[PDB]
Design a protein around this nucleic acid. Structure first.
Ligand SMILES: [Mg+2]
Ligand SMILES: [Zn+2]
Ligand SMILES: [Zn+2]
Ligand SMILES: [Zn+2]
Lengths: 171, 166, 10, 267, 107, 87, 97, 654, 112, 10
DNA sequence: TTCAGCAGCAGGTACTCTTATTCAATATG
RNA sequence: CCUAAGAGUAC
DNA sequence: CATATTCTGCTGCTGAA
């Protein structure tokens, strides 16, 4: 889910970069390094709050190196998927094993085992869809899904969902 | 301490075991402690919009779904540059699944949930998911079970649904 | 003790 | 062995001497907080001599004639006689000198006058005399109130510890008391007006240089005094009835239960 | 303070520690013939109060164990009746500065 | 770390720069000058980084602060500008 | 030439910490080794070309640090490890001074 | 090439946490299991898989990468293996500690003998430091020989409070070599306490019990003192002719295999115990070959085996011989000769030594030109450059590079070039008993094979020129160079903290001459006066008015020597019997830099407190004091050269 | 009084041959030897048994036994001593290392 | 001691 | 109110050079 | 290449 | 016939009269 959390990053600056725009270089290097990133400790990091005055502190010169080590402290918005949490999403793909639903920046793979027996896959339809007697779940279709399993991949977090519970599925 | 290797309970939102660093209270950058405020989808959307517009103003000095998508794309390209596929997807997701519109309604919702005196994660989950009835909301969010009375939850969800706009 | 540090005793 | 034992001793930024564990070895370095290289042997003029010589050297009486000062010594030499507030100032200065004499006799039992102290007051006086061309004939421009208050303010300005609490202030007063005694012994009203004959600017220059030299002589935090002490003890030992020299140093550093010549002194 | 002639039987030493807060200190007459505190090698020892100990640890940023130690068998420590955890201020006539103030904690 | 940092109004350390502080300041500044850092003082033709740093320190144009560590872990931040270089 | 113990002690007395560090590391043996913050041991497999860091046992891949220690120090720590002693190297303080 | 870039964050070690390996931690960190004592396979050309030189532990050849980390020998730190021991053996260095722990804990139920119900146990457990706690607990619980299932009540010794004791009798434990023998009090039965039962009783010790014994729940539990998995160090630890540790590990594996086969095939307890004792002996001698009493495990060649303990300890061990003191680069050593024409802070460096020792100068816009010239000069002429460090890590050698063409220097590169004049260099005479024996000088390149230093600086170094050798170290960075010049410089060391007096002074010929020059009889004519005045480098250019004008202009030696003395120096020393007039010309009076009276000798220009050196360095500065050293040496040496001094047999004849 | 007597003995040793050493060096030595409440010798049994860090304790004597005891007791080495940083090849907190140099953004902008 | 200057003891 | 039984061997700081060798002897593929 | 021994060099 | 193996420097009692 979405939170805002206090994060600190250590940035090393070469001696050549200590011009009057040191603050701007530090702030720009904070961006493009943590903005839109993924980690197992804090989930996704989407954006930084309170950019007007980011706490850069002083910055310590590494001895025998000359590079300065800054501990920049900031507020960051985080989207950490959690086990057994219900969130809305948009279905983007369907397959035999399950269907991939777009939740925020991540894709949740809901397996076919975690749906009521009335909902059945149909690859004959173009695009293939998880179709039921009462409704059809196609591309760009809303669905509320309870995430129950998350595997921590630094490159891109992966999650497994379910809609077996009551009032879980297409809205 | 410094325990080599780690033994801990598996994360579970229903059990409210969000994580060792997602506890109820967190130390702010000022040195004091603040309750871990959890953002619902609308509140998080407003926070993201405020942060992005403030960044755009700083860089300058130094509604329908389609037009909102175009506006967020333009503002995203103006504020930040590349490696924003995740942020673009999150922003379009937020513009899609937004429960509240502007500052007034989100402020009313946040103060009303604050009056409930419930867990920040639970109130954020209440604001995030647009339910219909009381027991349906309880079964949607297992962390809501046996935390507040049925009548009080029903009435507060009635006010939430009244505050639900567009 | 020990020896060293018999026994005690012996 | 000595260097390994003393390797972690260091003077920290609160002037305390601590080891790697933070344990205090000395609350101030050398019990005076001064660098050893800035210390020179100087004579404490109050501890030695006779009472009559001490009074002749220091006592000034503005109301009587036995221990008065020549009015030709200073510009206001004929108007200060009969003054009362200045007499109070002289009385307290001489009382402080007497207290310093008693304290120094309490510290150094043998009455040794030549002891190592940081700032060489004699050389500063000589430099002022050579720089301002004291003619030894013109009456001094200084007023006695100026001399006494300048000495007191200079003592207030000799800061070894910068803390602003009673403990640090008391430790600071303890750390400068011997040098303050030396300063009062040298910069006395009778001595300044008679032996040295300072002018106003010469006296102020002397005060400023004393303050600057004292602040320059303070030990620098980060000084590795343990290794310095170990080497300063070991090197003379390499240069080297009762056992002495290397065997005795071994018996002292290795705390030996039995030694060759256990002697006892009875007075 | 108990003053004895030659020795205390070990069967009597064991009951010397009474019910608190009563502390029994035993001194031998032979050791008390000469006052150790009047030796010129023995500097001035003053027991610090709890408030003074707190102030000393606050101003110098010291822990309990970072102070110099004095044993709870030292003749001066027995003389002044030091108990463990109490700090004695040591006034010493130093030859570099006229007065030096150290502090020793009882162990 | 807020408790670690002593407020500027009650720093109890000397306002003078130690010989070790001066040596490390000169070394750091010379190593930065050698690595193409901007020079804040106008050069009179000197090419040695050490004497460039000496000239910077003489007229107080070194933008560094000394973090002096107390034995308990607390520190004081003394700007090179306000440190008096008497030696 | 041998930079012996008491030459190092002379340099300590001089207060030239950076020159002593340069003598003992840059001039003689400067070894970069990878450790993890879970266990301070040097059992970190670091495929630098592939940009992969992994300490088996701790099952961690994102909590790796690099330190510059003499190769004699690394050999000492490895010999201690062979002698059933763990020299865990931690890059943060767990106790106040 | 050094080490290539690593994305892992760079930190410094803040805390070192010691402890013991758990067997499961060894199994988790080990990248391979060692099962074959042979280090090479039957082909004798490859490292055997599962052997002691398993490629998963590291590559034994430069041509091959490590099979685990896929890195060269330069990068690979070596990854540990593990040998699964058939039966547990005692870690030798912990045996005594084990003997203590098993004597503090009941050998049947695994609980500490004296709980808190004992009055002395509140005192013992309240101790803060773990070592003192364990000492007290041992010295109080070692004499208890019963588990005490029931103890007198703390409130009063009338009723009995029952703890979780078992009531068995603890044995008296001795060590017979590498094994522990327990004698149970007769209801004495002597039997060997098997390592298996000791490990079982150690694994049953409660967390509170062993944390009261000084152990830690996470880092060192007592049962980890018993070896069940031996960590095998990588070939970097035991490089190759196999190393001693390789042979010891081979013997350990041989014993383990023998014990395993004897246990599996079934054998009398005698053979099993013999194999177990052999394994214990091999493990112990692998960790420590200097066990008291036991015969040393001899290497194949009949010499003692060098154990890990032997490698760590001693003068030539790891700590003292490789970490506290190590052999360093950029250092030179040669014979020292005196030079009266060098400054106090100047050291003469042979041209060959200057050509071998090099300094890395960072390419900067301010020094792009001169460095380029040095690169053009090459390494075979002085001044020149030996290497060019590119920003990519490659290193261009000036030898074998003239064929490739001229090198264009870029900012950020390094020019590793011959040390030139005025380079700060550390200079030492060993043993180097004090800090003044290791001081920073300025290089002066000279065309001879000896270090040349001022005569005055030999006194702190305790150096003669009868064959003494001295060492020279060159800083390789700007920070080290700067702190060497600003902290360890020779002028700054003139006054030592050792005795708050100068350590350098006028010595040897310059002293004798300065006594002969400052005599009242010494009169110098115009020509020699002009030469001596010119020999003073900082002479202001005014000829002093002669002491005698008519009938012949004559200057005295004091007048000429006063030129070297800086202006503004006042010195007044009264020797024995001297008055304001000096009939004997003893004492010393100098007013405003002019020697008023007194023969200058060891008390004035020597390493004495209150002398000229001390006054000058405390009034005008260390640089002025060193310049005074130079000026006095030059003038006095010139005068003594043109006056002469000798000694002979007639000087010893009365 | 033991510290004063120890200083007097050391001073007599130093001045027996006429040499002079400043008071502070011998004062530091005798303060180190008497800071534990008793006379601590400069020997394996004296300064090397105080809990001042296993790495700097082992550098003097009895190295391997000190390492074994540290492993058994799970000692924490705070790396405050000179020997710890020498062994680890990092700047010891001595002399120039007793502080940290840091860059000020506001001061650097203030210069230009 | 040591040796030299076993132990003590052994 | 008061005393006899032991036992284990390295040893300052740097540096130069030379010389020997690192099992022999016997059984078996 | 390692180990051991010996001879010395300056303190 | 070639290779595997047989000189200085410290410590802890309690039992029986
Ligand atoms: Mg010689
Ligand atoms: Zn790990
Ligand atoms: Zn490898
Ligand atoms: Zn039991």
């Amino acid at each position: 889910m979405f939170f805002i959390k206090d994060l600190s990053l250590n940035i090393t600056l070469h001696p050549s970069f200590f011009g009057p725009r040191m603050k701007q270089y530090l702030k720009t290097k904070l961006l493009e390094e943590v903005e839109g990133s993924c980690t197992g400790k804090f989930g996704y990091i989407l954006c930084v709050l309170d950019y007007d005055n980011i706490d850069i502190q002083r910055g310590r010169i590494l001895p025998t190196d000359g590079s300065a080590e800054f501990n920049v402290k900031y507020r960051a918005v985080v989207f950490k998927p959690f086990k057994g949490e219900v969130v809305d999403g948009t279905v983007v793909s369907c397959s035999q094993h399950g269907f991939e639903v777009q939740v925020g920046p991540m894709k949740v793979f809901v397996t076919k085992h975690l749906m009521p027996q009335d909902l059945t896959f149909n690859a004959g339809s173009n695009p293939p869809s998880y179709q039921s007697s009462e409704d059809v779940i196609t591309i760009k279709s809303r669905i509320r899904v309870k995430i129950e399993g998350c595997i921590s991949q630094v490159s891109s977090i992966h999650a497994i969902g379910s809609i077996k519970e009551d009032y879980l599925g297409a809205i | 301490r410094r325990r080599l290797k780690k033994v801990e309970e598996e994360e579970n939102a229903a059990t409210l075991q969000l994580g060792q660093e997602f506890q109820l209270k967190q130390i702010n950058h000022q040195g004091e402690e603040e309750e871990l405020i959890a953002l619902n989808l609308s509140e998080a959307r407003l926070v993201i919009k405020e942060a992005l517009v403030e960044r755009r103003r700083a860089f300058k000095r130094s509604e329908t779904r389609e037009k909102e998508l175009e506006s967020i794309d333009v503002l995203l390209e103006q504020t930040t540059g590349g490696n924003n596929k995740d942020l673009k997807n999150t922003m379009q997701y937020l513009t899609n699944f937004s429960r509240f519109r502007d500052q007034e309604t989100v402020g009313a919702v946040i103060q009303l949930l604050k009056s409930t005196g419930l867990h920040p994660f639970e109130v954020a989950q209440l604001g995030s998911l647009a339910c219909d009835t009381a027991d349906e909301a309880k079964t949607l969010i297992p962390s809501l079970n046996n935390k507040i009375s049925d009548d009080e939850l029903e009435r507060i969800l009635k006010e939430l649904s009244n505050l639900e706009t567009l | 003790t020990x020896p060293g540090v018999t026994x005690p005793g012996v | 062995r000595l260097v390994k034992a003393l390797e972690d001793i260091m003077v920290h930024y609160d002037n305390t001497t601590r080891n790697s564990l933070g344990n205090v070895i000395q609350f101030i370095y050398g019990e005076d907080g001064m660098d050893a290289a800035h210390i020179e042997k100087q004579s404490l003029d109050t501890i030695g001599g006779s009472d009559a010589a001490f009074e002749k050297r220091y006592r000034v009486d503005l109301l009587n004639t036995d221990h008065t000062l020549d009015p030709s010594l200073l510009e206001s030499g004929s108007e200060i006689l009969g003054d009362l507030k200045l007499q109070v100032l002289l009385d307290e200065e001489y009382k402080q000198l007497v207290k310093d004499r008693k304290f120094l006799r309490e510290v150094f039992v043998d009455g040794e006058a030549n002891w190592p102290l940081p700032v060489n007051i004699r050389r500063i006086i000589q430099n002022a005399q050579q720089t301002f061309h004291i003619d030894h004939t013109k009456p001094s421009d200084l007023t006695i109130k100026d001399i006494v208050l300048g000495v007191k303010d200079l003592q207030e300005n000799l800061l070894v510890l910068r803390g602003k609490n009673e403990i640090i202030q008391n430790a600071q007063r303890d750390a400068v008391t011997l040098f303050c005694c030396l300063l009062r012994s040298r910069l006395a009203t009778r001595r300044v007006l008679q032996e040295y004959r300072l002018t106003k600017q010469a006296f102020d220059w002397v005060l400023s240089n004393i303050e600057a030299q004292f602040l320059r002589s303070v030990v620098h935090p980060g000084e590795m005094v343990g290794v310095l002490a170990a080497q300063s003890i070991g090197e003379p030992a390499t240069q080297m009835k009762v056992t002495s020299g290397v065997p005795r140093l071994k018996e002292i550093l290795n705390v030996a239960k039995n030694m060759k010549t256990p002697s006892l002194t009875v007075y | 303070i108990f003053v004895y002639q030659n020795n205390i039987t070990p069967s009597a030493m064991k009951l010397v520690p009474s019910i608190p807060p009563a502390t029994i200190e035993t001194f031998n007459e032979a050791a008390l013939v000469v006052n150790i505190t009047h030796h010129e090698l023995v500097p001035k020892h003053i027991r610090l109060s709890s408030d003074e100990k707190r102030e000393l640890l606050k101003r110098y940023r010291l822990k309990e164990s970072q102070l110099p130690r004095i044993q709870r068998a030292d003749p001066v420590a027995l003389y002044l009746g030091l108990k463990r955890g109490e700090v004695v201020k040591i006034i010493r006539k130093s030859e570099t500065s006229g007065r030096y103030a150290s502090y020793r904690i009882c162990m | 770390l807020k408790e670690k940092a002593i407020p500027k109004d009650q720093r109890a350390t000397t306002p003078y720069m130690t010989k070790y502080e001066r040596a490390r300041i000169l070394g750091t500044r010379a190593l930065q000058i050698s690595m193409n850092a901007p020079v804040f003082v106008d050069l009179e033709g000197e090419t040695d980084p050490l004497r460039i740093a000496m000239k910077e320190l003489a007229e107080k144009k070194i933008p560094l602060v000394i973090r002096r560590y107390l034995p308990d872990g607390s520190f004081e931040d003394w700007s090179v500008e306000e440190l008096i270089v008497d030696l | 030439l041998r930079f012996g113990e008491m030459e190092r002690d002379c340099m300590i007395a001089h207060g030239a910490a950076s020159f002593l560090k340069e003598r003992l590391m840059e001039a003689s043996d400067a070894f970069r080794v990878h450790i993890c913050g879970i266990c301070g041991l040097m059992t970190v497999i670091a495929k630098l070309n592939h940009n992969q860091f992994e300490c088996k046992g701790c099952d961690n891949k994102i909590d790796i640090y690099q330190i510059h220690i003499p190769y004699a120090a690394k050999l000492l720590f490895q010999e201690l490890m062979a002698m059933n002693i763990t020299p865990r190297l931690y890059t943060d303080r767990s106790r106040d001074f | 090439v050094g080490q290539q870039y690593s994305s892992a964050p760079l930190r410094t070690v803040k805390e070192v946490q010691f402890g013991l390996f758990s067997p499961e931690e060894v199994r988790a960190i080990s990248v391979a299991k060692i099962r074959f004592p042979e280090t090479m396979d039957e082909t004798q050309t490859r490292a055997k898989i599962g052997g002691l030189n398993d490629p998963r532990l590291g590559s034994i050849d430069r041509n091959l990468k490590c099979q685990t980390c896929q890195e060269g020998m330069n990068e690979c730190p070596g990854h540990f293996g593990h040998i699964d021991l058939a039966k547990p053996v005692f870690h030798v260095g912990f045996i005594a500690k084990i003997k203590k722990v098993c004597e503090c804990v009941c050998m049947h139920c695994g609980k500490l003998l004296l709980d808190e119900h004992n009055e002395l146990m509140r005192q013992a457990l309240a101790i803060k430091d773990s070592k003192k706690r364990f000492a007290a607990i041992w010295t109080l619980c070692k004499t208890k020989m019963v588990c005490e299932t029931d103890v007198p009540s703390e409130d009063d010794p009338t009723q009995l409070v029952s703890r979780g004791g078992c009531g068995n009798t603890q044995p008296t434990i001795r060590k017979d070599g590498l094994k522990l023998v327990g004698s149970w009090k007769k209801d004495p039965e002597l039997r060997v306490l098997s390592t298996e039962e000791i490990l079982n009783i150690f694994k049953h010790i409660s967390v509170k019990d062993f944390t009261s014994l000084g152990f830690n729940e996470v880092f060192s539990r007592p049962e980890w003192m018993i070896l069940t998995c031996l960590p095998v160090p990588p070939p970097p630890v035991r490089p190759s002719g196999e190393d001693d540790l390789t042979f010891k590990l081979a013997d350990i594996l041989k014993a383990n295999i023998s014990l395993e086969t004897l246990e599996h095939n079934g054998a009398p307890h005698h053979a099993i115990e013999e194999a177990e004792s052999l394994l214990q002996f091999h493990v112990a001698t692998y960790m420590d070959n200097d066990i008291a009493g036991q015969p040393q495990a001899l290497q194949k060649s009949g010499r003692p085996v060098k154990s890990i303990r032997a490698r760590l300890k001693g003068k030539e061990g790891r700590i003292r011989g490789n970490l506290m003191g190590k052999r360093v680069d950029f250092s030179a050593r040669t014979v020292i000769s005196g030079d009266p024409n060098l400054e106090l802070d100047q050291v003469g460096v042979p041209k060959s030594i200057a050509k071998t020792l090099t300094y890395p100068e960072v390419v900067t816009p301010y020094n792009i030109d001169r460095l380029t010239q040095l690169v053009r000069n090459g390494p075979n002429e002085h001044p020149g450059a030996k290497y060019v460090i590119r920003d990519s890590g490659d290193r261009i050698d000036l030898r074998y590079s003239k064929r490739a063409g001229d090198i264009q220097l870029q900012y950020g590169w390094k020019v590793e070039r011959h040390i030139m004049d005025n380079d700060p260099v550390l200079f030492n005479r060993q043993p180097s008993l004090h800090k003044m024996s290791m001081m920073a000088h300025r290089v002066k390149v000279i065309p001879y094979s000896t270090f040349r230093l001022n005569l005055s600086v030999t006194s702190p170094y305790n150096a003669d020129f009868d064959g003494d050798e001295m060492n020279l170290h060159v800083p390789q960075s700007e920070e080290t160079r700067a702190e060497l010049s600003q902290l360890c410089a020779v002028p700054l060391q003139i006054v030592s903290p050792q005795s708050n007096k100068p350590c350098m002074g006028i010595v040897q010929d310059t002293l004798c001459g300065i006594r002969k020059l400052t005599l009242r009889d010494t009169f110098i004519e115009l020509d020699q006066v002009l030469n001596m005045l010119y020999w003073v480098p900082d002479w202001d250019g005014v000829i002093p008015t002669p002491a005698i004008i008519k009938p012949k202009p004559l200057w005295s030696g004091k007048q000429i020597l006063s030129v070297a003395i800086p202006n503004g120096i006042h010195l007044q020393r009264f020797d024995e019997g001297t008055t304001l007039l000096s009939p004997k010309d003893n004492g010393m009076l100098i007013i405003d830099g002019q020697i008023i009276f007194g023969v200058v000798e060891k008390k004035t220009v020597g390493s004495s407190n209150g002398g000229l050196i001390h006054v000058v360095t405390r009034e005008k500065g260390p640089q002025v004091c060193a310049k005074l050293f130079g000026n006095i040496q030059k003038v006095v040496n010139f005068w003594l050269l043109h006056n002469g001094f000798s000694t002979g047999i007639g000087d010893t004849i009365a | 009084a033991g510290r004063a007597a120890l200083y007097k003995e050391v001073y007599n040793v130093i001045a027996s041959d006429g040499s002079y050493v400043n008071y502070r060096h011998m004062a530091l030595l005798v303060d180190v030897m008497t800071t534990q409440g008793g006379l601590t010798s400069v020997t394996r049994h004296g300064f090397n048994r105080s809990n001042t860090g296993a790495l700097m304790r082992c550098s003097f004597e009895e190295t391997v036994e000190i390492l074994f005891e540290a492993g058994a007791s799970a000692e924490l080495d705070d790396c405050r001593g000179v020997s710890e940083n020498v062994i680890l090849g990092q700047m010891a907190p001595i002399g120039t290392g007793a502080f940290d140099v840091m860059i000020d953004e506001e001061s650097l902008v203030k210069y230009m």
